[PDB]
Design a protein around this ligand. Structure first.
Ligand SMILES: NC(=O)C1=CN([C@@H]2O[C@H](COP(=O)(O)OP(=O)(O)OC[C@H]3O[C@@H](n4cnc5c(N)ncnc54)[C@H](OP(=O)(O)O)[C@@H]3O)[C@@H](O)[C@H]2O)C=CC1
Ligand SMILES: NC(=O)C1=CN([C@@H]2O[C@H](COP(=O)(O)OP(=O)(O)OC[C@H]3O[C@@H](n4cnc5c(N)ncnc54)[C@H](OP(=O)(O)O)[C@@H]3O)[C@@H](O)[C@H]2O)C=CC1
Ligand SMILES: Fc1ccc(F)c(C2=NCCC2)c1
Lengths: 287, 287
């Protein structure tokens, strides 16, 4: 296993360093809050005295930060020592800001590989976990084996915005579902039910979603938005029932209103008798 | 096999009447649009000439209509024939609208059992299908074997609104995730990707949800919103990345703005360093 530097020891960076040490990588770590490296150092990781010494320790520099602005904040001061470094940035951001980070790293002699990890910290090091990757192909292939300690690698192409784009595509569904979980837990709590009580039914419900994803994928892709499978107005009534159920129980209705508002836009566009999938045509229009 | 009356012959009512005839129940049917009964009548079902005749024909009256307002419009003129009847209303509506329906049936001498069927019409009669049930237990247990012809019976309690409550709790996450899928498709299409291209990742994202449902269940229930797995402020950045990725790609931001606003309410209320799950405290009914 090759040596490498890991900068950023939040929940994902910690899980990353432990998986790299489990594999035997010679690991050099640095974190703004130095306290968070103590456990990794006790396992054998090398604590870098500064962020510049961390970058200087290895060719491979893995970042796990909040966004790409944090990369400039951490790497900016010693940016003149980034020449010849491979920076694998595993931080979420937009495709545009991901490309800007790649341009900035190139200006200073390094090369950036963009990554999007699709697993929680407990999934790091597990072969069922995956991460999108995009950036220079030669630099990626050269360090793929090291990156495969963390997750399976899904290389998407040269453009760094690709891995970020694929990450956001899955994350918009993920956050939508998880906030709906909190909304369902909030409704349950208003009626004397715990998250543990609704957990089996909530799990059963989302576990059946892939069949609907497959059913509607090919319908959306051929432009088949006919109301033969479902009628949008019937979905409006369904989401109106959710909203008013929430309101009757005194639970917040900000997100249920937003969902109802989109169905109302669907009906305002004349899609009442078409499938609810027709709202993808509204969602494609800007603003 | 006990005889019963079925009113409401949409796709759900059709599958129900067929399942009842399959098992051998004597079936009296009525629908506002009489021609919808043609196939069931040719199978052996008895066509009632009027809704009043339908209600008078049997003690058990199963309803598969749009909502509870449709029950008042339909059963109103016949409200006197309701004395001694057990009305099993399988129409989806809010818990409060269901409870008002149960009081209105009681005012006219009947008893309402509320059902929440969690399967499409093709699931009616199949062994793994299920439906929540609520209402007076004795009247339910007297007709439980007949109802078990349609789905598994999941009795939830005496309060008539409980079946609707459990139905709405599951639908919250379903519509949130499916609308998030449409958002992901729109973003994908704006960047040259079809729904078929993102279907595997969207299925992986959805299928991994039960892990997070179980992970945050007891943490929410015990009030443990520690940031050991995630910080809310990191989630705020993540959903802002989605929002601005949508804007950068010229697609709609209505739902992403609503998601960002909730995270910012979490930060505004002092939860920036807690898990994102702590936003359930903002969604919960007051005091
Ligand atoms: N948490 C999860 O389950 C998942 C998150 N991700 C993504 O992975 C990334 C890592 O997130 P996560 O591990 O949760 O942790 P956080 O984003 O909460 O923090 C990660 C690290 O960023 C550092 N940091 C943030 N801002 C600055 C700054 N201005 N200057 C210096 N250091 C800074 C923190 O330093 P310090 O320790 O000093 O605070 C910390 O070590 C995010 O972009 C996230 O979207 C992807 C997969 C899943
Ligand atoms: N996938 C599904 O279909 C599922 C449906 N459900 C719930 O089951 C219920 C019925 O389902 P489904 O058959 O699909 O619904 P439909 O809306 O297709 O059927 C509505 C039925 O109610 C009748 N009706 C509506 N309004 C009135 C009125 N004002 N007066 C008299 N009759 C009226 C219609 O009669 P007419 O024929 O004359 O129009 C028809 O028989 C709904 O509440 C639905 O949400 C539950 C889960 C799954
Ligand atoms: F921002 C967050 C917060 C909590 C999380 F579990 C995540 C994850 N990304 C992929 C699923 C886990 C991201």
């Amino acid at each position: 296993p090759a040596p490498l530097t890991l900068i950023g020891l939040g929940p994902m960076g910690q899980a990353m360093g432990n998986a790299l040490l489990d594999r035997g990588h010679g690991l050099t770590v640095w974190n703004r809050t130095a306290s968070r490296a103590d456990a990794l150092v006790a396992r054998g990781a090398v604590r870098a005295p500064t962020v510049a010494a961390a970058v200087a320790a290895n060719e491979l520099v893995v970042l796990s930060l909040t966004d790409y602005d944090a990369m400039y904040a951490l790497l900016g001061p010693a940016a003149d020592a980034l020449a010849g470094k491979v920076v694998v940035n595993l931080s979420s951001d937009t495709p545009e800001k991901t490309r800007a980070g790649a341009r900035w790293i190139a200006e200073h002699g390094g090369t950036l590989i963009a990554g999007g990890v699709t697993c929680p910290p407990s999934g790091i090091g597990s072969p069922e976990s995956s991460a999108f990757y995009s950036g220079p192909s030669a630099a990626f292939e050269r360090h793929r084996e090291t990156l495969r300690t963390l997750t399976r690698t899904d290389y998407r192409g040269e453009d760094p915005g690709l891995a970020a784009l694929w990450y956001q595509i899955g994350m918009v569904m993920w956050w939508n579902a998880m906030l709906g979980y909190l909304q369902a837990v909030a409704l349950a709590d208003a009626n004397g039910l715990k998250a543990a009580d609704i957990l089996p039914h909530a799990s059963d419900t989302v576990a059946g979603l892939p069949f609907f994803l497959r059913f509607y994928a090919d319908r959306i892709d051929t432009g088949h938005h006919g109301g033969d499978a479902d009628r949008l107005a019937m979905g409006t009534a369904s989401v109106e029932h959710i909203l008013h159920t929430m309101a009757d129980s005194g639970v917040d209705t900000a997100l249920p209103e937003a969902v109802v508002a989109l169905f109302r836009r669907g009906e305002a566009a004349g899609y009442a008798e078409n499938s609810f999938s027709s709202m993808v045509e509204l969602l494609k229009k800007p603003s």
